[PDB]
């Protein structure tokens, strides 16, 4: 039954694995350093996070 | 071995020079040796985004930065030196790491 | 939905003897960060807790993908009236006060 | 940009509904009419179900879904 | 207000339905009977079969379980309470089961005790 069908062939990419912290999208996500942020709410909390405009 | 290191990390220069002086003086109160401050190379972290949350209007990014200084200053002393020495009511950002090696 | 009464009664007493918890979304993943290895299945217990907060009768609040609950005492009313069990077993959470 | 348009075949379905009989007249039956009675149903030989495991009947490899045993002679 | 077999018999099934449990379908009950899991079983004959009466029987008898005959199951379906879900419902009951005890887990009763006393003697 539930186990003729669940892990058959590995996923080793998936994209629906991931999702923003904040708000959980799928798209514009940020995974260097951690930050597993959307682009957007990583903007919104970037100030926050420590990362600061200079140049 | 009696080498114990201590090892400041912080994202702004001006506290933890403060903490790095500060523990200089210390050591330098009490009869030791240290080894003066070592400066890593502060690494910088970037992040560089699209402004538009759409993908709309003039290609515009943001440059964030993010740059982590790391100092690390060598002396021989005891754990309960090191111990008494970090109990001074620590400015805030200043990570301190000791290791005894 | 599609959620059995053992499991029910089990996600009941879980309630009980919890009362103030924290939570994440999550349904389809087989492992969980904080509310697994409860000997029970992970997707019944969450769709339990999911007709618990959105039956229609104690209200919510979803952000940051997390969960914190005001369990009001209309749902603590509800329980009592159901399964019959009074307030006199107060919960062990009114220590270290 | 159109429809997905998926109409040309199935225009409606009917729910399928197992006529489960609720007495024991096709499953199970006596043929004696006496407090003994014989089993219409080989004994299953392993051990790895209860003590009582009762197997049904196809034309063959019984299908309990379980086991999904078959006779075979090696 | 009287003390009797239905006046207990109405809140155990009742109990034994809010509890889950529940040997429901043709399977897990019979399976259920023959594993000698619960020590026991209420069951009931108001129609024109006797060859299911005698089965039943022969069982209780094999596994030592005296039947007792129930007059107007249709007092217990109407004394027991069948509320439900809004207020419409009545969902009736012709199987008693009671897995685990067969009393009940959650209280302890002496309901279980005369029971177990009359079926010795």
């Known amino acids: 039954g539930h186990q003729q069908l669940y892990w058959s062939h590995p996923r080793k990419f998936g994209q629906g694995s991931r999702s923003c912290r904040v708000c959980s999208n799928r798209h514009g996500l940020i995974r260097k350093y951690g930050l597993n942020m959307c682009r957007q709410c990583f903007r919104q909390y970037a100030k926050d996070i420590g990362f600061i405009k200079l140049d | ?101 | 939905m599609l959620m059995p009464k053992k499991n029910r009664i089990a996600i009941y007493e879980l309630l009980f003897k919890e009362g103030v918890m924290v939570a994440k979304k999550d349904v389809h993943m087989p492992k969980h960060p904080e509310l697994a290895d409860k000997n029970v299945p992970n997707l019944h217990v969450m769709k339990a807790m999911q007709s618990l907060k959105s039956r229609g009768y104690v209200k919510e609040q979803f952000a940051w993908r997390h969960f914190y609950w005001y369990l009001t005492n209309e749902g603590i009313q509800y329980l009592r009236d159901y399964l019959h069990l009074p307030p006199e077993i107060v919960p062990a959470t009114l220590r270290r006060s | 940009k159109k429809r997905k348009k998926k109409s040309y075949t199935t225009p409606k379905k009917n729910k399928h509904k197992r006529k489960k009989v609720k007495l024991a007249v096709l499953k199970y039956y006596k043929v004696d009419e006496n407090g003994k009675i014989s089993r219409l149903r080989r004994e299953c030989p392993s051990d790895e179900c209860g003590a009582g495991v009762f197997m049904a009947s196809h034309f063959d490899r019984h299908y309990c879904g379980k086991c999904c045993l078959t006779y075979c002679f090696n | 207000g009287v003390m009797d077999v239905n006046t207990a018999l109405q809140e155990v099934l009742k109990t034994a339905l809010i509890h889950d449990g529940l040997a429901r379908g043709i399977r897990e009950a019979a399976k259920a009977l023959d594993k000698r899991q619960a020590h026991l079983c209420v069951l009931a004959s108001n129609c024109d079969e006797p060859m299911y009466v005698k089965l039943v029987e022969a069982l209780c008898a094999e596994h030592q379980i005296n039947l007792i005959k129930v007059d107007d199951n249709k007092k217990l379906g109407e004394w027991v309470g069948l509320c439900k879900i809004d207020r419409e419902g009545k969902p009736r009951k012709v199987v008693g089961c009671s897995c685990v005890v067969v009393k009940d887990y959650g209280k302890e009763s002496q309901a279980k005790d005369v029971i177990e006393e009359y079926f010795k003697c």
């Open chain 2, 1 to 101: 071995i009696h080498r114990i290191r201590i090892t400041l990390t912080s994202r702004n220069v001006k506290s933890l020079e403060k903490v790095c002086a500060d523990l200089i003086r210390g050591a330098k109160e009490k009869n030791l040796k240290v080894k003066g401050p070592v400066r890593m190379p502060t690494k910088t972290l970037r992040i560089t985004t699209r402004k538009t949350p759409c993908g709309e209007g003039s290609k515009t990014w943001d440059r964030f930065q993010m740059r982590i200084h790391k100092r690390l200053i060598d002396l021989h002393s005891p754990s309960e030196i090191v111990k008494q020495i970090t109990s001074i009511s620590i400015e805030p950002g200043v990570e301190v790491e000791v290791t005894i090696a």
